Assembly symmetry: C3
């Protein structure tokens, strides 16, 4: 009666739950299948899309903008993010863990300055025109796509650029100098240098990128570490009412059963393997079990209030976006810290469970560690 694997509606595997928007020899862009189409239980995520981006060393994703706000996050590798504005531009160096909100319609390009490592990015998108999807407008002209400038008539273009259409087509379109093949190209090492010296490394600005990784972990012991930034801590995060998390776990570590009070969590596996257990209510009852094994790039959604537990089967790190973030309270159901069960009066425990109240409190204090424990032990 359990919902496991690809039958688990909260599981979005990279193997079967993504759609490739673009892919070539240098990298790819993939968009996660819609949340609400997979399950009505997370219908309120219908206004969010998730994009995964990967590109090989010394690559560049060409200038483009979208009718969607983006909360870009670097899961693995390093990158140069340049936001191009109407009368200025800003380049930033994003290290693993760095996040940055990109207002909708902001033209931008991305570089993987690393000479040997791939760049992996996870991006939360909030569409503007249609609540369920957005469009990527590439200003560039490649064999894979026409520049949107091509949408204007000859007369408009000639009067706009104060030039003959033959020069315009020759220089910008190349649709009788040759154009690149796709929206992800490889740059010469020297070129990466020029772009690199102009970028600014992040050392909570309303604009500049931030790294939750270099803040004090909210939870930290021998089995795991948990970094988290909330809208209370960051203005970009407050605008989106979203919190972000980055958690490390050693092989054999267990993230104890817990539930987020009001936040809907979208998590992604950065590296490692994990077994996750989610509890829902069956459908005047009985609990509905949702199980899944997560691997690199897999996405999983933890609905607000649904109890959850994660067992790391290998060293692991996962990232998470918390929707409806403001004042979320993480309620643990075991351990000696943030444990809501330990906050219930003896008299209430007496009637809430079969055994006596004192017999329940005794069992509750058994586990002396908090948040992360030995999966065995």
């Amino acid at each position: 009666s359990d919902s496991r694997g690809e039958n688990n509606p909260f599981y979005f595997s990279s193997d079967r739950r993504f759609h490739t928007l673009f892919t070539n020899q240098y990298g790819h862009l993939r968009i996660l299948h819609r949340f609400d189409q997979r399950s009505k239980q997370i219908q309120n995520l219908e206004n969010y899309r998730v994009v995964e981006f990967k590109s090989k060393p010394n690559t560049l994703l060409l200038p483009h903008h979208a009718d969607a706000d983006f909360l870009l996050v670097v899961l693995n590798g390093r990158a140069i993010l340049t936001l191009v504005n109407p009368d200025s531009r800003d380049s930033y160096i994003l290290e693993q863990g760095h996040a940055q909100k990109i207002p909708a319609g902001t033209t931008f390009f991305l570089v993987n300055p690393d000479d040997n490592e791939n760049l992996r990015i996870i991006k939360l998108a909030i569409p503007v025109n249609n609540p369920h999807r957005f469009q990527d407008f590439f200003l560039s002209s490649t064999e894979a796509q026409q520049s949107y400038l091509r949408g204007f008539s000859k007369n408009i273009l000639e009067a706009s650029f104060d030039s003959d259409f033959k020069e315009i087509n020759r220089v910008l379109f190349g649709e009788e100098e040759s154009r690149e093949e796709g929206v992800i190209v490889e740059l010469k090492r020297e070129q990466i240098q020029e772009l690199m010296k102009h970028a600014k490394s992040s050392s909570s600005s309303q604009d500049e990128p931030f790294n939750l990784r270099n803040s004090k972990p909210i939870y930290s012991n021998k089995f795991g570490r948990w970094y988290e930034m909330t809208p209370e801590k960051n203005p970009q995060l407050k605008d989106l009412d979203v919190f972000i998390s980055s958690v490390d776990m050693k092989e054999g570590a267990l993230l104890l059963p817990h539930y987020n009070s009001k936040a809907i969590v979208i998590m992604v596996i950065n590296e490692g393997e994990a077994k996750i257990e989610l509890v829902g209510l069956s459908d005047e009852l009985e609990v509905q079990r949702y199980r899944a094994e997560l691997s690199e790039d897999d996405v999983f959604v933890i609905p607000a209030a649904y109890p959850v537990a994660i067992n790391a089967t290998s060293n692991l790190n996962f990232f998470a976006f918390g929707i409806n973030a403001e004042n979320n309270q993480r309620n643990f159901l075991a351990g000696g810290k943030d444990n809501v069960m330990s906050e219930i009066p003896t008299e209430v425990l007496e009637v809430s469970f079969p055994a006596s109240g004192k017999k329940v409190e005794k069992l509750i204090k058994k586990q002396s560690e908090s948040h992360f424990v030995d999966a065995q032990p």
Copy 2:
């Protein structure tokens, strides 16, 4: 053009428009049929649900949390509301009229500390995961439901509680019969008093804390006379209400009293009958003739007054109803008769002259005939 009784889409009778979520000898929890499913004319109430809870003396609603924001209101009686947080807990004693916003996901339990009076509660619910409904997660293990802790596997449970499953199952699940029968149990006085010790009181004389239970009945009525009185708290005056953009009303009317025709400018009102009976007249527009919506209201019935729709209420017995005003911010109640808050009496003569058949003279005259305000006698 007269939709009345159970054919009135804005009427949600206690009799046919509720679904029982749980019921037993000590009390029951019911949820109103979805608003949007009844009428597209109130489509924007789709993200709201309404729950009615009623329990006997000395009872307790076991600890649980829900994926929905709650605006809990004690319609009748008194209760101890305890909010159990990750690392602490707060208890409050709620007298009739008290309201408190319970953030989504907050584990809480509820007790009727009164020895002879029932506890009647009405909750405005705003679901988080799905806009149309929420789930109730009970931590307890009873014959009626499994603890959500059961959803986890034995290995996770053992590791989590650092104990053998044999013990865990016996202590928390047990499926002699040690478990209670349902999610609402009866407690002994000693237990009640013990759950009362740290419970805080609002105390009108004291200085209130914006994040704790508040009672609109301890404030000065906005309207008040021989026939009825109206208490009201708005988001402008309360942060909990502001976060929800909702106002709350508590209206007292004596038998034979008429609540004059009026309309709320922008708030969509969900009203519920606390005690008594009344006849309601709501005015809508047909798809230009007017469309009439009438209903006879009694205890626990819910009725929706769409924003801008004119409405009048006639109390056929002493009455008290409570109301939730959605899209509340800066709402302006426009009365259509009487000598106060009457929008008509604010229309220049020349405009009244062409607006109605008679001269602006005769019209302004008919307007000033009623010297009462808000509440008048229903049978002069």
Copy 3:
């Protein structure tokens, strides 16, 4: 290529409006639902647009609607009176004036001019149902019963403290009732409620974007714009308003609004508009074109590139939804040209020609925003 009536972003005065009421003294029309014509602008589903036109010395009878209104005077003059529970406020509205009318506010409208017509466009935000609103007229005419008629004899008698007969005579009169919701007033009358009114909570009264410094301005056109960050009423609605003047033969350079969904209407004149979308295997652009005439409405989705040719002297007004911090990115010219902010190395690979050449072309056009439609 989608053009004319086949362009889903084009909402013509000729066939995309529905008349709510019309008589010899004026009419009220509401635009067909945006989302019903195109899913590309589904997020405009909670908005409606109404066009109001009344001749000299007319009055729109007192009424209220379960919808927030942002009323704009396209052409003409007007007296807007907001009738509250315990008071009333009259405002003189000149061409270009805008005023927000909170939902449920009873108001009446007068065209005090002797010859000029009153033309208004209203942005509406429904309260009870997201897709439409109800207009409640207090008045009693041959076209509509007063909503008071909805209450019973007993309620009415007790409410007004009078026998029904008098009530039914003074208010309903099914010395008779007018023909419709728009009536003509004698000059004497106009003068009356005219002198009471007030022209030119301060930041809660009508405002006029044309009394501000144009954001862009030259010999070919000028652009007046008021955003949420400059007006409280606009901030509540998260809407910006625009008034653009263009002389015949002028070209508004290719550009796009970063996050604002724009609803524009042609006040006077005619224009040619070119919008760029994407088709949905080389990815091709989708061209949306149309000729915009008086009262026509056209929607520019956020992020969609657009350009406009004024084929006659022209003025258009626009509503910007999701306005907060909108960034208008121009794609040519000197000022606000995002292409000129792209580094040489990046341009080098984004286009066929070399970076230096791309840069040379981009700088060829030294003029900004508005230019002559001639190279």
